[PDB]
Design an enzyme around this catalytic site. Structure first.
Site, PDB file in Angstrom:
ATOM      1  N   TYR B 122      10.484   6.621   0.746  1.00  0.00           N
ATOM      2  CA  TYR B 122      11.390   7.059  -0.568  1.00  0.00           C
ATOM      3  C   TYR B 122      12.245   8.161  -0.464  1.00  0.00           C
ATOM      4  CZ  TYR B 122       5.809   7.048  -1.580  1.00  0.00           C
ATOM      5  OH  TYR B 122       4.787   6.532  -2.479  1.00  0.00           O
ATOM      6  N   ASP B 237      -0.298  -1.918   0.276  1.00  0.00           N
ATOM      7  CA  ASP B 237      -0.556  -1.484   1.800  1.00  0.00           C
ATOM      8  C   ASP B 237      -1.964  -0.291   1.247  1.00  0.00           C
ATOM      9  OD1 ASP B 237       1.117  -2.557   3.500  1.00  0.00           O
ATOM     10  OD2 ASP B 237       2.346  -1.787   1.847  1.00  0.00           O
TER      11      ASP B 237
END
Ligand SMILES: Nc1ncnc2c1ncn2[C@H]1C[C@H](O)[C@@H](COP(=O)(O)OP(=O)(O)OP(=O)(O)O)O1
Lengths: 150, 356, 356
Positions: B122, B237
């Protein structure tokens, strides 16, 4: 910020809702069908001043490809969109005009044979307009509606 | 009462998942629940670097996005950064102190690790899209709509850590600290651990998936190519995360690992149901704030909220809870695209038998 | 008093390394100590999979080791497995509660992660060399020699975790529990954190390097090729570990991060010195019991002990402590290999000027 060109020829700023409302409509009573799918599939490419008719025609061809074994309903979805689009070029609106006015105007345009007026009377045309059921245009399929359109 | 090494030579295979005995030796030649061991090997294979991702064309695509749209993106990105920052530390802090088995111990640490990587991605996406990253980060803390969810996440982890501390300092029993009376019952400590996992699940099953829809939403528009790739990798994930939590809940609600826990699980079933509904609802409210300026092509307040329900039922039915929302077909099937010579032979006799 | 997400909008750059405020947001666009940020990126690049390694020929090479030489190997392997078991979990547990900066939060978790991988490699090496891995694992628990080690490592990590719990449940000041009187002073909590790191350093700087010598010892003999590779990879990752701990102690002993800690560090200097000497010594005694039954070309009980001192001085001088052992050269320089038609010209006038 961008603008669109409506059918009548009026121009107003772009509004996604207009598309959402429409697609949400023809999707009514259908399953396994998603509104978002058509919109993204369409990859519709807005650009300053775009005619509203083109936007409608692009979404129709989109939901047209959706039709698949997993989600067949789509072929009623596109069909519904097509008829809505056809009603615009034919009568400028969804609600069709009187059977009698419609034949009269056309005859003057040279579309229908003038014998229709010499064989039937105005009082009769209004009697036949009752048998008509424009709500039967939804019983069609994209494959069918597409043929009639062409 | 906690030790990084336990002197006693206990059998890892018999020891329960939690509240057992602090894992002393780290062996992987045998597991009580191969389910976790598989998650480790599977998670390690999905090891990705946020850097490898070319996120360069996203800088221009973001500037082109309409003022209402920038809102949708940046806002959704802020929330995601918030979650994975919590689920970056929360796991180890609240799980390690309880874990009493290796196969699960390593999992949690590896599970919390993958989360840090997400928090890193991010940061790599923001700097490329905006000029001053601080403008975004400093908001995640002050923002109104962001804080409640973060606060909610904070409540359950901390509540579990607090008791876990007393269960080691104080043990079962009523104790007084400065006039006060503290009741430490292992039965209660198990509820917090269970309820907590229920929240971790909904967060990594519903909360996160509700944001991916918006992330991949721009992808279908061929917009924000880079950021969609990164987000896509996180999804993979992420799946492993929600999976591990589910199995832990089932093994506890089935009385498999701990006979008492199944009881306890039956008592909280009602409270656990209201939990999912609580989060499932908060997801809707955000959709309204995420769209308060306007809508995207093929995503909006209405269409999004629909997905929230669709996924909630699947996630809740997975752990063993009644479906709160009405059964529905998926509202955004596109989200699944990001979630994984002529023979001349003649015979007269053969045809001569054929009568005309 | 711990939160997985601190509501307050504190400045991550001003906040101290430990005892500050629970890291809320995970940003990496700016770090107070770029030292840690570098360790993360550097550690992630050394990501290795214990499986890729070919250890197959090690099964025959080990069977060949005379029972005593099989002693040296298996024994040294057991200790290492013990070391990274603890280094598996201890970090996150003890470290995490206290950290108040995001660069470091993520380092510790990544640091503890790399350790789990190491614990995994050993399990992959054993099953390939022996028939029944349980024979080895069940011993680390019961071996007494392991026991002096294991208990000691647990004690400091636990002693720090205990107080950390009280610092959150009670806080600074004197408090009473069940009649008993508990004194929770942040000043003392800082000593445990400091002393603990001192142990973690010696363990990941001296303790581990004392075992590598034996591991690479067989390598020089072209023996145990597979094991040599794995152990070699662990060494690389290990370096980053001891480095981070050092940088962490200096910043605290220099009063850079916390003014009080510099003072505290000066008070424990003497106790910290005895710590390294304590471990440095235990390294010698174990080596004697490495060979109780024999010695093998390269390793000696004598030659090995020499290396213990050589490295201890370098490690201690690094953190800022007096050299306990004499100054000496590297007793095993081989270990560093694992850590990282002519011209004819005639002139008469030119020589005619030369007088004989
Ligand atoms: N301002 C707009 N911005 C974006 N799309 C629009 C806008 N207005 C209409 N559309 C969409 C909706 C339909 O999907 C498609 C066709 O519209 P259509 O109804 O056929 O013509 P129209 O605009 O003259 O009638 P109406 O006013 O009822 O929308 O274009």
């Amino acid at each position: 910020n961008l603008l669109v060109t409506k059918r009548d020829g009026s121009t107003e700023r772009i509004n996604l809702d207009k598309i959402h409302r429409v697609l949400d409509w023809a999707a009514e009573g259908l399953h396994n069908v998603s509104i978002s799918q058509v919109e993204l599939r369409s990859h519709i490419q807005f650009y300053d001043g775009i005619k509203t008719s083109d936007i409608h025609e692009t979404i129709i061809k989109a939901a047209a490809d959706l039709i698949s074994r997993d989600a067949p309903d789509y072929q009623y979805l596109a069909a519904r969109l097509a008829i809505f689009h056809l009603r615009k070029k034919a009568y400028g609106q969804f609600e069709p005009p009187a059977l009698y006015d419609h034949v009269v105007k056309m005859v003057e345009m040279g579309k229908y044979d003038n014998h229709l007026l010499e064989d039937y009377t105005e009082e009769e045309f209004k009697q036949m307009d009752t048998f008509i059921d424009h709500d039967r245009d939804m019983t069609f399929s994209y494959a069918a509606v597409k043929q009639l359109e062409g | 009462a906690y030790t990084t090494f336990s002197q006693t030579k206990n059998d890892q295979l018999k020891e329960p998942m939690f509240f057992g005995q602090p894992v002393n030796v780290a062996r992987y030649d045998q597991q009580k629940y191969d389910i976790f061991e598989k998650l480790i090997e599977k998670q390690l294979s999905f090891f990705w670097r946020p850097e490898e991702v070319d996120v360069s064309r996203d800088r221009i695509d973001y500037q082109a996005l309409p003022e209402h749209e920038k809102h949708i993106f940046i806002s959704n990105l802020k929330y995601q950064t918030l979650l994975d920052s919590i689920q970056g530390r929360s796991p180890n802090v609240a799980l390690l102190p309880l874990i009493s088995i290796p196969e699960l111990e390593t999992w949690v640490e590896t599970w919390a690790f993958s989360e840090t990587i997400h928090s890193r991605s991010y940061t790599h996406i923001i700097r490329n899209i905006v000029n001053d990253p601080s403008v975004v980060f400093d908001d995640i803390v002050t923002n109104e709509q962001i804080q409640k969810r973060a606060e909610g996440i904070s409540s359950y982890y901390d509540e579990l850590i607090e008791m876990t501390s007393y269960w080691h300092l104080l043990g079962e029993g009523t104790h007084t600290v400065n006039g006060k009376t503290v009741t430490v019952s292992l039965r209660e400590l198990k509820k917090k651990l269970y309820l907590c996992l229920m929240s971790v699940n909904a967060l990594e099953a519903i909360r996160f998936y509700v944001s991916f829809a918006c992330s991949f939403a721009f992808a279908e528009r061929e917009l924000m190519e880079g950021n969609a790739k990164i987000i896509r990798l996180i999804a993979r994930d992420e799946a492993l995360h929600l999976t591990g939590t589910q199995h832990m809940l089932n093994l506890l609600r089935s009385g498999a690992d701990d006979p008492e826990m199944a009881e306890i699980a039956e008592e909280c079933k009602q409270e656990c149901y209201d939990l999912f509904v609580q989060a499932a609802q908060q997801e809707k409210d955000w959709a309204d704030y995420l769209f308060r300026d306007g809508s995207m092509i093929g995503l909006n307040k209405d269409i999004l909220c629909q997905y929230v329900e669709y996924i909630t039922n699947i996630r809740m039915q997975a752990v063993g809870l009644d479906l709160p929302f009405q059964t529905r077909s998926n509202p955004i099937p596109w989200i699944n695209t990001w979630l994984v010579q002529i023979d001349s032979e003649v015979d007269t006799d053969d045809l001569s038998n054929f009568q005309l």
